């Protein structure tokens, strides 16, 4: 009689493959150096959120203009995974859905980790950030 709820992603369960394959000191060195080389851009890691049903992202490392908006970055990722116009896409930054009106520079200055990278997870649904 019970509706079993077993298909929703655990909050905070996202694990970035980028951090499992690159130690902190290597990431921190590259992030700090790329921020000095391009002070008007931010380095971003984008990977698929848990239990998402959506196409794979071939590349995870992006150097984005700080003045690019989140809505424009949604546009970029949609094309790279070849989403249909009707397909949904959500971003998550520290377990929260960022405002589409924010700039990537605003997200970076608020949410970048100590390795100087900004981490974004993506999914076809919003559950992971609610």
Residue numbers in the entry: -12 to 117
Can you provide the manuscript's text about this entry?
Mammalian ATG8 proteins comprise two subfamilies, namely LC3s (LC3A, LC3B, and LC3C) and GABARAPs (GABARAP, GABARAP-L1, and GABARAP-L2). ATG8 proteins promote autophagosome formation, elongation, and closure, as well as fusion with lysosomes. The canonical LIR motif is a small Θ0-X1-X2-Γ3 motif, where Θ represents an aromatic residue (W/F/Y) and Γ an aliphatic residue (L/V/I) (whose side chains bind to hydrophobic pocket 1 (HP1) and HP2 of the LIR docking site (LDS), respectively) and X represents any amino acid (aa). In this study, we examined the molecular determinants that regulate selective binding of the centriolar satellite (CS) marker protein PCM1 (pericentriolar material 1) and the ULK1 complex to GABARAPs.
We identified one main LIR motif (PCM11955–1958:FVKV) in the C-terminus of PCM126. To elucidate the molecular basis of the PCM1-GABARAP interaction, we determined the crystal structure of the PCM11951–1964 LIR motif bound to GABARAP. The structure was solved in two different space groups P212121 and P43 at a resolution of 1.55 and 1.86 Å, respectively. Both structures displayed identical canonical LIR interactions comprising PCM1 hydrophobic residues F1955 (Θ0) and V1958 (Γ3) deeply bound to HP1 and HP2, as well as three hydrogen bonds formed between the main chains of PCM1 LIR residues V1956 (X1) and V1958 (Γ3) and the main chains of GABARAP residues K48GAB and L50GAB. On top of these canonical LIR interactions additional specific contacts were observed in both PCM1:GABARAP structures. Within the core LIR motif, V1956PCM1 in position X1 formed a hydrophobic interaction with Y49GAB of HP2. Notably, the adjacent C-terminal region engaged in multiple interactions: (1) a salt bridge between E1959PCM1 (X4) and R28GAB, (2) a large hydrophobic contact between L1961PCM1 (X6) and L55GAB, F62GAB, L63GAB, and (3) two hydrogen bonds between the side chain of Q59GAB and the main chain of P1962PCM1 (X7), as well as K1964PCM1 (X9) through a water molecule. However, in contrast to M446ATG13 and M359ULK1, the side chain of K1957PCM1 in position X2 was partially disordered and the aliphatic part formed only limited hydrophobic contact with GABARAP. Most of the residues interacting with the C-terminal region of the PCM1 LIR are only conserved among GABARAP subfamily proteins (R28GAB, L55GAB, Q59GAB, and F62GAB) and LC3C (L64LC3C and Q68LC3C). Thus, these residues may be critical for stabilizing association of the C-terminal region and mediating selective binding to the PCM1 LIR motif.
